[PDB]
Structures are given as structure tokens and as C-alpha cells.
Design a protein around this ligand. Structure first.
Ligand SMILES: C[C@@H]1CCCN(C(=O)c2cscn2)CC1
Ligand SMILES: C[C@@H]1CCCN(C(=O)c2cscn2)CC1
Lengths: 265, 265
């Protein structure tokens, strides 16, 4: 991959692997989410990061995902090449937004797009804090100055408020535990695992007859390596919509909430 | 990737991704196992095996199934490094075929790991393993070297050693392991790599933090269904050596058995 001519965004091509596809022989949404993560890490490394600054490392601060929103029009087939362009933009003292565009390497048509909201947090106390002006100036130079939104729409699904699922849930997957493959290089559960856990409560009948078009996932609390999670889903609707909730198997503490939108094959 | 000059083996280069590495920022053994699988699929596709079945095998409802996997790693590739893998097949008479791999450093050319696997023929409906017929053997002998080519040539080595059954009580255990949709392949079967991850779940974190996995030999006895639950058992048999057993959470039916060998960091 490489930064674009203006150095304000990054592009990378990926060939879809055998183990990355589903029953329809096309890449899963979790594989897509992993590819978004990979191009985001490479963009950060290319502009002198390792996504902490010296001021963030000095104050023990980190970037944490608050929301992820993915919309897929066409999933790449096994063996196809997909090009992803990614970039960041400041949103004032709230935090930063990171967006992506997925394109067909042969046709150049847009086959998917994503947006995510990130907030600053103290690594040790887990206390969120607004972005200080001194931290902002350090990365503003790597972002475009004019707004550049993967989801410009006058009123888009990426910024909709998500409500809390009411018991009893219509569908459920109980006793989900992460394994070592679910952890990152810092022994924390990978943000993609939550996507897989959310989708575990969707009935296989929906999975066999429908394709996932949209998914918006709010991140509320981290799941520890030794925690157990319950995945809950309720239908809220040619198109199927679901409301999701991830919570701790025991006390029922909320870790995630989201919505998915599926269309008929 | 591409077939070598003689068309008797295949090579492919992989860049190590951010989500593919462990706590010491070097690729996991499951990532290595996935890369072995990917280069094996590409080798099969390049010599005329469509979405590793032949026209005669398709006609008779026959498939290739792994019986044993043996991986030895000297140096795990770091995040961002390129690793080149060369793979090939060889017939072993009526028993079945063997598939071997050599892992090399793209910069130095030194061997950083090597693997071998034994495959047998099985009816995909009855699960009855059969010997390699004759009309089938001749159909693929032309894609394998005629003189022996072994990733593990040593006379009386670890790849061919007999594995015993773990005796209760196990010293360590991880119970209630269930596969999720990401653990399944394009045919809704549990991926052979998931078993490696499940075996390693019962290894104490103390071993994982102080040691590196050098060797792993895994026998495949029975498939784990999408709705099955597995228990992972381990006992120290000693460098550190362990004896492993995967079995069904309920009745205690054997699905896998193996051994690992770990070196101090
Ligand atoms: C271009 C970009 C500048 C902003 C920070 N960054 C990130 O990737 C990031 C995503 S969420 C918070 N930090 C590194 C590189
Ligand atoms: C070169 C090779 C030769 C025949 C078998 N094969 C495999 O991929 C295979 C079978 S069992 C493990 N590997 C297809 C192509």
C-alpha cells in the first residue's frame, strides 16, 4: 500500500484468501472489517505513528473505537483484488473519524464503504477525555482540511441513535468466550470479534437466504479475556432489520449494541 | 504466487498483517497454518483443480481429508515481514498423499519453518475412508515429483511418531469450546486450524508468556459439528513438552490428539 499523491489518504490492494470467504465463496464482513483494520494500521505507520503521538504516550492516552458503521454493496469473491482507500478527519474536541471506500480493482466501481468514530481515553483509568488542542495540532496536518465523508447523505444510517434491546430477546447465543486468536498484540479482544458475536444470534435461515448490507455497532465496554458474553437479537421489521445487544453472561452488563440490515438474495 | 519452473511445486509470498500477530508482535502458529492452507489451495487451482477434487473423485463422491499435520517453526515472522512458502505433494501409494511446505525469510533466504501433512480419501456422505484407487492415483501423479522430496527427511523423526491418549485426570483443561461462523469454511465445516487454536487453549498462560512454540503434531480423528461443544485437555510430559486431547464435552468422544514442544525465550 501507499499514501496518495497529496499524502492526505492511503490506498491498499488485498487479494481475497480461501479461508476468508463464506458459504457463498465471497469474503465475510469480518474479513472486510479485518482488512479495514490492516489498511488503517499501515496508514498510521506510513505517517510516523506506532496511533499514538509523543504527547499521547506521555499522558498514557490511547484512541478507542466508539462506533463502527459498514455498508457493503458487493462482497469480493475468493481470488479477487479489492482496493481500499482510507483517511482521517478531526471532529473538534470530540475525537477523530476514520472512513474507508472499497472498490473493485478491475471495474473501479464502489463495492462498499465504512465510517468509524474514535475517542481519546486514559489507558489505565479507562476515563475518556476530550482531545486537547496540543494533541489535535500534531495530527491535523495528516488529515484533509475540507470535509471528506464516506457517508455524506443529508440523513444517513451511520449517525442514527441505537436503542437498548428489551428482554425477552427473540433470538440468542449464550456462553460466548474469546480464545487467544480473538486477542490482539496487547492481549485485548479484537474489535472484529464483537461483529462475529453480534451475528451469532442471527438465525441461520436469514444467513442462507439474505446478504448483510448494513451494520452499525456501538462500543460501550471492553470484554476481558476471561469474561463470557450473551448475544441477543430481535427482528424490527424484501428487507430484514434486527436490533442487537452484547452483554456479560452473568450480571448482564452492556458491552455492545447495534443494528443490521439484510437484503434478499 | 506461481508454480516453479518445473511445474512440480508452488511458491507464494505473504506480508504479515497487524491482526495476524501475537503478544510478541510475531505471527501466530494459527496464522502460519492459515498461510499453509492458502498456498495449498492456490497450488491446486493452478494445476486444474476447480472450486482438491478430480473429475473421477467428483463422480464417485470422494474427498481428501487431513489425517495428520506436523509444523516446526524456528523463527516466527514479524508484523510487516514478507515470508515465502514453497509447497508440493507426493503420493504415498494406496494410503494417500502427503503435502509438505518450506517457510523462508524473503530477505535472507534462510529456512524459518517447515511443515508436513498426511491426507486420506473419504466418501463425503458415508465418511468411510478408502484407499487410493488406480484411475485416481494416475490422474494426479503427473503434478508431484517422482523422486522423494521430503520437508522432514530425518530417519525416525517427530512427524511420524505415534501419539498416545491422554489419561484422566488432565493436568490443565479448557472446557465448553464452541465454534462460531468465522470458524467454518465455505462448505460450513469447521476449519482444520480451529483445532490448533482449541488445543493451545489448555496450555497455561505462564508457558505462553515465557516460551515459544517450536513443534506441534496434530492427529485428526473425527470432525467437530457446527453444533458440538469441545473440551481441550493438556498434561506436561517433561524445554517443555505436552500431551493434548480434544473431545466432545458430553460423551467424551475423541476428535483430536497431539503433542507440542516449547522452547524458553
Ligand atoms: C492520518 C492519521 C492521523 C490521525 C491519527 N491516526 C489514526 O490512525 C487514528 C485513527 S483514530 C485515532 N487515531 C494516525 C494517522
Ligand atoms: C499438486 C496437487 C497434487 C494432487 C493433490 N492436490 C492437493 O492439493 C492435495 C491433495 S491432499 C493434499 N493436497 C491437488 C494438486
Amino acid at each position: 500500500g501507499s499514501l496518495t499523491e497529496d499524502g492526505l489518504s492511503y490506498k491498499e490492494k488485498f487479494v481475497v484468501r480461501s479461508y476468508e470467504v463464506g458459504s457463498n465463496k465471497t469474503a465475510t464482513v469480518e474479513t472486510i472489517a479485518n482488512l479495514l483494520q490492516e489498511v488503517g494500521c499501515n496508514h498510521a505507520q506510513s505517517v510516523g505513528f506506532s496511533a499514538t503521538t509523543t504527547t499521547m504516550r506521555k499522558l498514557h492516552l490511547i484512541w478507542v473505537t466508539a462506533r463502527m458503521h459498514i455498508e457493503i454493496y458487493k462482497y469480493p469473491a475468493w481470488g479477487d483484488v479489492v482496493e481500499i482507500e482510507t483517511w482521517c478527519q478531526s471532529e473538534g474536541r470530540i475525537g477523530t473519524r476514520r472512513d474507508w471506500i472499497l472498490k473493485d480493482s478491475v471495474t473501479g466501481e464502489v463495492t462498499g464503504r465504512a465510517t468509524s468514530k474514535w475517542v481519546m481515553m486514559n489507558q489505565d483509568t479507562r476515563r475518556l477525555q476530550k482531545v486537547s488542542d496540543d494533541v489535535r495540532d500534531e495530527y491535523l496536518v495528516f488529515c484533509p482540511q475540507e470535509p471528506r465523508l464516506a457517508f455524506p447523505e443529508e440523513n444517513n444510517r451511520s449517525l442514527k441513535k441505537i436503542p437498548k434491546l428489551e428482554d425477552p430477546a427473540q433470538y440468542s447465543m449464550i456462553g460466548l468466550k474469546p480464545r487467544r486468536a480473538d486477542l490482539d498484540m496487547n492481549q485485548h479482544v479484537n474489535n472484529v470479534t464483537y461483529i462475529g458475536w453480534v451475528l451469532e444470534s442471527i438465525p441461520q435461515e436469514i444467513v442462507d437466504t439474505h446478504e448483510l448490507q448494513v451494520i452499525t455497532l456501538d462500543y460501550r465496554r471492553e470484554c476481558q479475556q476471561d469474561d463470557v458474553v450473551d448475544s441477543l437479537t430481535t427482528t424490527t421489521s424484501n428487507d430484514s432489520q434486527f436490533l442487537h445487544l452484547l452483554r456479560l453472561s452473568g450480571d448482564g452488563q452492556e458491552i455492545n449494541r447495534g443494528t443490521t440490515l439484510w437484503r434478499k438474495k
